[PDB]
Amino acid sequence: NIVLTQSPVSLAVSLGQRATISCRASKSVSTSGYSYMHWYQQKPGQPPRLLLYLGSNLESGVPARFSGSGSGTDFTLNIHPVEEEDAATYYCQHIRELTRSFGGGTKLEIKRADAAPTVSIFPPSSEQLTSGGASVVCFLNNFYPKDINVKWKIDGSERQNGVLNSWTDQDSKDSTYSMSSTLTLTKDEYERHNSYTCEATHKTSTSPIVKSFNRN
Amino acid sequence: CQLINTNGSWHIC
Amino acid sequence: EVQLQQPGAELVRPGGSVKLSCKASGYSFTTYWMNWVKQRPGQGLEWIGMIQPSDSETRLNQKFKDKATLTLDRSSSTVYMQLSSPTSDDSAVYYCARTGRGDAWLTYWGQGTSVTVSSAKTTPPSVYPLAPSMVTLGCLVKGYFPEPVTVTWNSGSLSSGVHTFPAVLQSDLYTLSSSVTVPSSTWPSETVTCNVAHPASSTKVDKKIVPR
């Protein structure tokens, strides 16, 4: 089998800067005037999107900002001015022989000015309480850089059990990150207390951004 | 021009 | 327009069987090559094989020699991949994709079928509204199996300012949340409704976010 090795494993590139991605094959993928190397772009939750075929041919609709070059065993993906929508993983793929192989991928992250999290807290819905459950939800939306921490407090006391966090990859329109934190309690537990508090600590500020509601 | 086997086939000049 | 139709997910008992479908439309079925590609969420792409619909020629990745069988149905314009003796290792998204010319570059792609190989029940999600310049709202999709779930806001019309977070697993049950940010003037003035699809159980739930 041809092994396709890409580099780097990942790279960060500012909103005007340059991204250059490399793909080396185990043996040539060229024959005649053709190089059977192809490139794809993938964003989470979607299929790959063909960007370049035959080394240097832009698929229809793909911005002129994307360009490919190479010959034989060495191939290059270059991206003109890097826009925000380019945050993706990029894959090389050969059509030279049976057993197509893909490269291992290269995640492109965009570099960006800092932004504080927009924090929103949500009490359990009436429908959930009816079933004996009580999730309190906190979104920490549209921040940069990606590192963030959440503290839950119930009636003023930190709470560690029953929390589950989830994070998005970089947003395609503003290059920010977001996180969701859910605190799952029982109805009886939820109903033993009054004050529920979600605090976010992010690089942008020395003080946590606090959001609160009171049952009652 | 020559026939290249990728596994369908191509005629490339 | 060219379209590759794949089911959202397949739940398969280990050892049971599963035969993934990819229905092609928008072009003469007996042209080009249909390829099958495997991907564990988070990881890379791996090529299983291809079938040529004009004569049913197949090419197969010898690593799947004993796992993948590729067939077709001309009258259905459908291509199939069957996986033998499904284990947890066969749990992945499987895409079908059609070459743009000949046998080469993959122009057209199915949405992918997430196969989950598991004994567990099929459990539909409970959907819960999450209500409190710009205002943030959400939906909590709790307690479903297996993945995935698809969340839209206003049947597709609220596209921007949305965040649908990766699911978390807790007890053979997935939970996810979605956020949407609209202008104040827009809500409660206008209805905002999250639409949840859970393919593996054929479920579709709509839930309007009502203020408290």
Numbering used by the authors:
A (entry chain L): 1 to 216
B (entry chain P): 411 to 423
C (entry chain H): 1 to 132, 138 to 217
Sentences from the paper on this structure:
The conserved region from residues 412 to 422 of E2, encompassing Trp420, a key residue for HCV recognition by the human receptor CD81 (9, 11), is recognized by several neutralizing antibodies. In this framework, to gain insights into epitope 412-422 conformational preferences, we generated and characterized a set of MAbs that selectively recognize a conformationally restrained cyclic variant of this epitope but not its linear counterpart.
A crystallographic analysis of the complex between the Fab fragment of the C2 MAb and the cyclic peptide was undertaken to unravel the basis of the reduced affinity of the MAbs for the E2 protein and of the consequent inability to neutralize either HCVpp or HCVcc. The triclinic crystals used for the crystallographic investigations contained two independent copies of the complex. The peptide adopts a β-hairpin structure that is stabilized by five hydrogen bonds, four of which involve the main chain atoms and one of which involves the side chains. Peptide binding by Fab C2 relies on hydrophobic interactions and the H bonds established at the antibody-combining site. Both the heavy and the light chains of C2 contribute to the binding. The main hydrophobic interactions are established by Tyr36 (CDR L1), Ile95 (CDR L3), and Trp33 (CDR H1) with the nonpolar residues of the peptide (Trp420 and Ile422). In particular, the binding of C-epitope I by Fab C2 appears to be rotated by 180° compared to the orientations of the other complexes.
